């Protein structure tokens, strides 16, 4: 009463006043908690669930049930109070100040006799004040909780409850777990529709139903750091705040798209649900960053189109393709373009090389895992598994069981979800039909036939045309000039210079992979030492020309 | 009543006492985002120290006074509360918060919000009641230590980040504060002096942080200009002498144009290291072409490969580079991957703390051949993005560190085929892509006889100086020098056995001889070799002392 207000807020008084957001569709959990509160002894329920699902919202709905009057006789006229243990632990720089405040609180509850306590952060009840063996909050609340005199409600998390409270059997037998469900998409839509009036009053903006649908279907499908529905309500509230500061109107999909793109860094035009427009123009979107391989681009575009269609059974990974051919043809930047188009991030792709990890000890590092950690952070990521030749049998067993099941069984005891990830196997093993037959019967004589039958599409990359090599050289001098424009370097590459760069930078036995080693050693070091020794300066065009070979050669940086 | 228990900000801008802010529009707009919300409407300002956590608050106050804020912040007054002005304290704080609730349009600024977490007995519930609109200002590490682990606080506080401004942004901040500081100190400041101050602040100062690290320099320079005067212009020389007084660094030509400092490497390194002048000029031209900013500025400033025997000059080259580039040998950090051969030691990548101690420091990653695979992955990540994801959770900047990989792999036409086998073995024993991200690969050369004797003379210079400390005299002949070089000749392992040969032959015998007390004080000691012709192995040759 006069001391409880200094540590918490009267939910019941605000419920009469009417400052509580209403809850819809959580009647089962409210009824279960009301069932537990109706017990004679051990009437303390603990709400078990992930943060951000609505446990405090469930308790507020219970308070709304208290004020309106749909509760039994033993919950009638019971003032609900909330307490935080952080406001009691803090200030205990002396022997027993925390215990003094807690005892004053309990004495006030005993005098009032009609208070149900909400003490969130229930996990610190064992550790508050002194250590776990000495006199703590648990050690003083235990002989009062078990006799059904102090009605308290907790709120914790699965792992939190399991490895704090379940260790203490005496506390476990005093708290009844009431599991709180993670709401579905329709539940979030219904809650947003219910809170439409409150946020219209607060923000003075009009909110549309399509905005709610888009907010929910992007919150659950880009954001994975937490769970529904705090993310969606935060999104719509921040969009309303954005309009409220930009006005000095009507909420549509553009505003929620731009605020979530601000959240994630993904560009706004990709967030709106014009996915058919994405798949219509995806070929030139992929081709502006890839070079050549027109048949490969067409094959992968049709494959991605049929896999995104969803007409297949929803028990399969979204993508599983074999990339074969000589090294350096462009499979890596092809995967990079895939990561850019499908998810809007170049770093959303996970790049692991499997040839270095041989034994089961490194297989523990693989799964049990960094791949597991990244697909738990964000399951909607393309995965790269290079060098499938050198793996050992347990790795093939794990890969094929992931393929056939869509699930991965790690050493951390979580079956991660791979229903939307894209599996890319860039293996250098092994005219187009002859190559398909060669890779097919080579895989049959090396792998199991089920691996070949399980894969979706096999894509073969041909050799790069010399003109396409010149095109890649032009592409790289574009970025070289872009990074050199700070000193006004306008570089001009003559055709003979292009031919010599293509000759020195491309090794047919090694593919195009040594390009990055060749290009800086043959161009950037020379221009850098010419800049340092003042042969050329800023504000002048550098036209490089090469002699002694027009179709040991010396280059001139004119 | 808050006037005697706190300091106003919106009413402080009436007199113009608050300093102007420059270029903080994005952070102020994010604060505008957060303050105009119904849930999580109290922003907390996360920033590394000395950046302007308060400066955005005076910027918001100036925006409120000038009138570029939405309707919810009309007629909002900002108050900073002081705990010094606050039984009686509890009721005073209670009546202050009740007056805030009664007024209804007072927004509070509290710095170091983790200190609230003996005022927690008052604010914690009535903040939960929602009648305070508040902006917090806390460093990220106390945020993670106190607020993030307290689950009852994230329902009302939302994080916003205040990063380090760029150097041009700091120049603009100095340009903004020019009028105030010129008014107060009645001294004149040059724009070139300001840009030099920003650059040298980023260069020679580590403990303090931008942009306070430049503004304190400018105030200090103006103060010392006042001291030297009692037609005043603060210039680059003033900033250089401020840094010389501050960091204890000299000021003659080292706080100057960097091109002259980078073009003189050969003589100053040759002052310490011995020979290998081809590798010296190769690594000198490599660091010249890499550190000049001509590379992409989002990558490490250097990546070096010194293949060769251990302790035969590559470690000496590293020590000389540390002594030249930054003036100190202690910034050179010694990491060898021989000790980091297990995953538990590999996840330690003692590494973050000492490189955060001095970001402008060289690094040594020794024996990369026996490094772990997770070490390979981390080095590949560092080479690719130029950053690092530590266990603490901050990106350690590598715009400034140069990478040195000292390895014993592979150990002029003979040296040509040695370089051929070095590149072949980095192609096969290592992956090609790891060495593809390396600026240059240079291989050391085996020592010649003159190189060995100029090891020998400076090796014996230590004991010669010790003898001069006792007023002795040491003289060596050329025949004894040649024999002593031949005894220590071990090309497989290098110059380390030369230390042992010197120790067993010269120093030990002379330490016994000075105790024998016949060639002690007042006589020059001259070593000589007899019973030796000049070609023999030296088995019949005995050192003699005169
Ligand atoms: N069914 C619901 N009805 C009303 N509000 C809800 C519902 N589910 C979630 N919320 C909102 O989600 C936010 C987080 O819920 P809350 O239980 O208070 O904290 P947490 O779920 O993070 O423990 C609250 O602001 C609440 O208003
Ligand atoms: N953009 C800016 N414009 C003007 N002044 C600035 C700017 N950024 C920082 N400052 C000045 O630099 C000083 C640094 O303040 P700081 O110590 O970071 O505050 P806090 O202690 O709250 O973190 C401030 O007093 C401010 O006047």
From Swiss-Prot, chain B:
- Whether Repeat counts among this entry's keywords is yes
Keywords of this protein's UniProt record, alphabetized?
ATP-binding, Chaperone, Nucleotide-binding, Repeat
Task: Provide the taxonomic classification.
Answer: Bacteria, Bacillati, Actinomycetota, Actinomycetes, Mycobacteriales
Family to which this protein belongs:
Belongs to the ClpA/ClpB family. ClpC subfamily.
Q: For ATP, which residues are the binding ones? A: 47-54, 308-315
Q: What does this protein do?
A: ATP-dependent specificity component of the Clp protease. It directs the protease to specific substrates. Can perform chaperone functions in the absence of ClpP. Degrades anti-sigma-E factor RseA in the presence of ClpP2.
Full-protein interval shown = 170 to 821 of 848
Region annotation I: where it falls in the sequence: 2-230
Tell me which species this is from: Mycobacterium tuberculosis (strain ATCC 25618 / H37Rv)
What happens when the protein's gene is inactivated?
Depletion experiments (using anti-sense RNA) stops degradation of anti-sigma-E factor RseA.
**Quick check: keyword Repeat in the entry?**
yes
| Start and end residues of each stretch annotated as II | 234-411
| Protein name stated in the entry | ATP-dependent Clp protease ATP-binding subunit ClpC1
Quote the cellular component terms of the Gene Ontology held in the record. Answer: cytosol; peptidoglycan-based cell wall; plasma membrane
Please name the GO terms that the record assigns under molecular function: ATP binding; ATP hydrolysis activity; protein folding chaperone; protein homodimerization activity
């Amino acid at each position: 009463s006069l001391v409880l207000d200094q540590f918490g807020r009267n939910l019941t008084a605000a419920a009469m006043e009417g400052k509580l957001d209403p809850v819809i569709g959580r009647e089962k959990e409210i009824e279960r908690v009301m069932q537990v509160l109706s017990r004679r002894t051990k009437n303390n329920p603990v709400l078990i669930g992930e943060p951000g699902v609505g446990k405090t919202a469930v308790v507020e709905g219970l308070a709304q049930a208290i004020v309106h009057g749909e509760v039994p006789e033993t919950l009638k006229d019971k003032q609900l109070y909330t307490l935080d243990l952080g406001s009691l632990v803090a200030g205990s720089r002396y022997r027993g100040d925390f215990e003094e405040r807690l005892k004053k609180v309990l004495k006030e509850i005993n005098t009032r006799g009609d208070i149900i306590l909400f003490i969130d952060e229930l996990h610190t009840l064992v550790g508050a004040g002194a250590a776990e063996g000495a006199i703590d909050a648990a050690s003083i609340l235990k002989p009062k909780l078990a006799r059904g005199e102090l009605q308290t409600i907790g709120a914790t998390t699965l792992d939190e409850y399991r490895k704090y409270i379940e260790k203490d059997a005496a506390l476990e037998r005093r708290f009844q777990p009431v599991q709180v469900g993670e709401p579905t998409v329709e539940h979030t839509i219904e809650i947003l529709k219910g809170l439409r009036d409150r946020y219209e009053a607060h923000h003075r903006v009009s909110i549309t139903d399509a905005a709610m649908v888009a907010a929910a279907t992007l919150a659950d499908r880009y954001i994975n750091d937490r769970f529904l529905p705090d993310k969606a309500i935060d999104l719509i509230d921040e969009a309303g705040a954005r309009m409220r500061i930009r006005r000095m109107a009507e909420v549509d999909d553009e505003q929620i798209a731009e605020v979530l793109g601000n959240w994630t860094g993904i560009p706004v035009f990709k967030l709106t649900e014009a996915e058919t427009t994405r798949l219509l123009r995806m070929e030139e979107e992929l081709h502006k960053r890839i070079i050549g391989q027109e048949d490969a681009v067409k094959a992968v575009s049709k494959a991605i189109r049929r896999t995104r269609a969803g007409l297949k059974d929803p028990k399969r990974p979204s993508g599983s393709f074999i990339f074969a051919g000589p090294s350096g043809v462009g499979k890596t930047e092809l995967s990079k373009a895939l990561a850019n188009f499908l998810f809007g991030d170049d770093d959303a792709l996970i790049q692991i090389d499997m040839g270095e990890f041989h034994d089961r000890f490194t297989a523990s590092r693989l799964f049990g895992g960094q791949l597991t950690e990244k697909v738990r952070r964000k399951p909607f990521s393309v995965v790269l598994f290079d060098e499938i030749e050198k793996a050992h049998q347990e790795i093939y067993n794990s890969l094929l069981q992931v393929l056939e099941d869509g699930r991965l069984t790690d050493g951390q005891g979580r079956t991660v979800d791979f229903k939307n990830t894209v599996l890319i196997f860039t293996s250098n093993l092994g005219d187009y039909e002859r190559m398909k037959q060669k890779v097919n019967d080579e895989l049959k004589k090396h792998f199991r036939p089920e691996f070949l039958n399980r894969i979706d599409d096999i894509i073969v990359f041909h050799q790069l045309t010399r003109e396409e090599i010149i095109r890649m050289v032009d592409l790289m001098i574009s970025r070289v000039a872009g990074q050199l424009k700070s000193k006004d370097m306008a570089l001009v590459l003559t055709d003979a210079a292009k031919a010599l760069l293509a000759k020195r930078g491309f090794d047919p036995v090694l593919g195009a992979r040594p390009l990055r080693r060749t290009i800086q050693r043959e161009i950037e070091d020379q221009l850098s030492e010419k800049i340092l020794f003042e042969e050329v300066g800023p504000g002048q065009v550098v036209t490089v020309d090469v002699d002694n070979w027009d179709g040991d050669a010396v280059f001139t940086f004119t």
